[model samples]
Target: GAMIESSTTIQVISAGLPRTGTKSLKNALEIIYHKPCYHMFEIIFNKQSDIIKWQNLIHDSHMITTPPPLTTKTIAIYDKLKELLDGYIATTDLPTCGFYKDLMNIYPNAKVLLTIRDKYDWLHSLRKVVLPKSNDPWKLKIEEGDKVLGLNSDFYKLTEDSLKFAFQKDDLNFDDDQVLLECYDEYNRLVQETVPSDRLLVLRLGDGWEPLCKFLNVEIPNGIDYPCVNSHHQMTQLTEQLIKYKSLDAIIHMFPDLI
Candidate 1:
């Protein structure tokens, strides 16, 4: 089959939260822009075996991956696999991906997308949808409510430190609850300050497909719904209990004075 070549010179920096419709954006970008995106979920599922390779690539300070043939989506997958065999993204979360910064430094012309939502809603949604399934010890700690989780209950400290390091800020702090709020806020701040207004797009979860299509300059495909991947019901149920018991809010507000 003949392939359509991508004419656009593109790079996407996903400074968005994990859920907040990131999967929709990922799928849409791949469909609209006709390019691959290195989303974390894709890394976990598709490139599980290449974790160590990816880690070594990042550890050695390599950032950019050579663009594969437009005809070969699998080639793009292979390239990402080669880069991540050493487990780079596994060592960090979205806020800690130095590759985002490195990509900006290397491709000064790249576009950035910051996805956002209300803090309480985001926490509620994330706890239910993402956290329960997460294997990260910290997340598991929050889940089980063991003293071990309390030992590092400050989500603000964890998130802020990750963002500070990823964004290269020497001094940055936020109150725990505020960290949840600030994650959204700082992405807005960074987009306003660093990305040229024309090159930056902010998508809210509620806006859905219409605004996203407009931003990417593509028409919505008829009869196509946002793909419902990552439908982990157990995760959602666990998240519900976490929200019901107020565990997540408690963790975020661990040090209210900081907020």
Candidate 2:
């Protein structure tokens, strides 16, 4: 959960996509900083109010549209974001990934972290977890669970718009493998080019704590292995249970072992 108030600004801006080990990175950064890190999971589990805020924020606003230049409106957008993420020490995954350019300007001292994986592996993992096929039997049940939790619009569809803005594509299809692969590669390339070399670190999926710690200039935690939570199969099964119970808390209450 996000802290109520803190003076610290974002120290790292992670321009990584949904399935690129962002969850592990989130836990790692939290361990290093002892502060909250923003993720899509935070949006879902924190407050229902934030869901609508993000829904509106990611659509057709200055965030989604190309800007004329830095104007008062642009500053307002930055300010709104700053306020929204006041106490967090870092941000990962969408829709924050799409805002790395603005964030670089906002937190000039903050380092940028880009997590990557093999294109085929990334897409395979994405299809299984984040963006299931239209014909996926579990897709409807997941959507139903999200709806029960008040997420009526597809959250990943919002993520698609985030990627669309990130890759500067007017018409992109998530279901199209070639198009997605193209955008994914181009996005990684552009991030590398866009940020200063000194301020950037490109981390592959399994690089774990060594590179991250050395890059951030932090000592690795004493005995903890890099986090390895959030399996796709388990999350799918969890969502099935969620759909049945209509509440995450209910499932946690009923299945103490699940904790």
Candidate 3:
């Protein structure tokens, strides 16, 4: 019942970072693959998020062990991953973005999808949706997230582990152009360098159904439009909805905290 690879096999592992049309890709894959596509959205906003512990293994890795775990394979890395992803066919966004290397090894049959975007555009999107905000005030939210572990236990650190991953760094400064540029560029290159050319599909949003369908060898669904969703403005509205001021001492807050 602990960390063990599930018999449910993964068909695809998305190795792309966020702000890279990962949202659209998630939607697209579900249509093509006809099964659920896992995204950070699935984990971060689900409250009682099913996959929180899978992320802990990555960001909180220093604490792992069982039969010399890291040096061996007790509650081993891939075992926990397959166990957590037990039912899903495709996965995208933060968890896979952070753990693509291991996923490549675990699900060797799974096709790799590396979503990409225009660099400066990606940075601007991050500034608005991802930079620290009131809803995502890390210290407090992580505590709230602690209570939502899959085991239904407390003291589990899901939010901290997720946001630490959602942004790819603990120290983030949106005001610094160099820092933003470096992160955006570095992430794209890392995916490019890591995923083998034959297995990797570098996707840009609006490139649409043709390439995706061809690569997966699946029929593009009929009558369904290729949807473009989750704009910076819409995300800002969602973030704003997380807070309301009644008085300095009393404020209304939203639940299902996102990064």
Candidate 4:
């Protein structure tokens, strides 16, 4: 049945931008839905071919089809990548949030989750936990099965592009806290205006499980802690692993046929 289906319908799409308890959402969704949760880390673990196609989609590297607007094109790209996400019931992080409206059009039955946190804390967390850990992944020139991959190095370009789209400029100033807060506020507003009240849930990690379980129509798990994660340390480790995946050394020892 799964194979016969053209696109396995996604049950949830995170309309929230990153650094907003996405990791916790991913973990909780995995437990509640019992399917793969597509998050940023999924990019690192996914096949090279799939990542390349995603990179092209995000960057508009190819120009084969042109009738639809970029928004419509985004949906087409999502359709092409559906097979790779076959077992996944939910999606989060960059690009997903960027094109959430388009996705909602395709999968009308799915619910949307908008994750938010205090502006200053969330912005601080993003700069410290993720931005600082990002650059080196771009510098590595990795060879995989006689094919050299460097321009993107697996969605690095896509992620960077998403940041530019999110902040609405090529030169984003992290020092301008006032403006940053405004941008964050605007994003929340868009999601609020776009998604209908019944199909959308605005969540903060600190709100705990009761609200989330109620929104999703799932019983809260018993005798377990609500998933609270501190990102800086873990993000550092994941960043290093992604760099390793893009390093020449991994191709030689860990995965001989990397591509």
- Indicate which candidate wins on TM-score: 2
Model 1, residue 101: displacement in angstroms?
4.3
List model 1 lDDT by residue over 81-199, tens digit each: 33442322111134324345444443455566777767777766655544433444445534454232232333334444444554445554433445545655665576567666686
Cα lDDT of candidate 4 equals 0.65
Question: Relative to the unseen true structure, what is the C-alpha lDDT of residue 218 in candidate 2, on a scale of 0 to 100?
Answer: 78
lDDT by residue for model 2 over 1-259, one digit each (tens)?
3323433779999998878888889988888888889988787767446655655665635442234356776776777778778889999988789889888878878999999989988888788777777887867876877776667665656667777777777767667888888888989998999888899999998798998989977778879889876667667777788888788877866433223
Error of 1 at 100 (Å): 3.6
lDDT of 4 at 163: 60
C-alpha local distance difference test of each model: 0.50, 0.78, 0.63, 0.65
The clash tally of candidate 4 reads: 0
The RMSD of every model to the true structure, in order and in angstroms, is 11.2, 4.1, 8.2, 7.2
RMSD (CA, Å), candidate 3 to true, equals: 8.2
Ranking by lDDT: 2, 4, 3, 1
Whose TM-score is higher: candidate 2's or candidate 3's?
2
Candidates in order, TM-scores: namely 0.55, 0.87, 0.71, 0.71
Pick out the ten consecutive residues of candidate 2 with the lowest summed lDDT: 60-69
**Poorly placed runs, candidate 4 (over 4 Å):** 1-8, 47-49, 61-75, 81-84, 133-154, 167-179, 236-259
Q: Give the lDDT of residue 22 in candidate 1.
A: 66
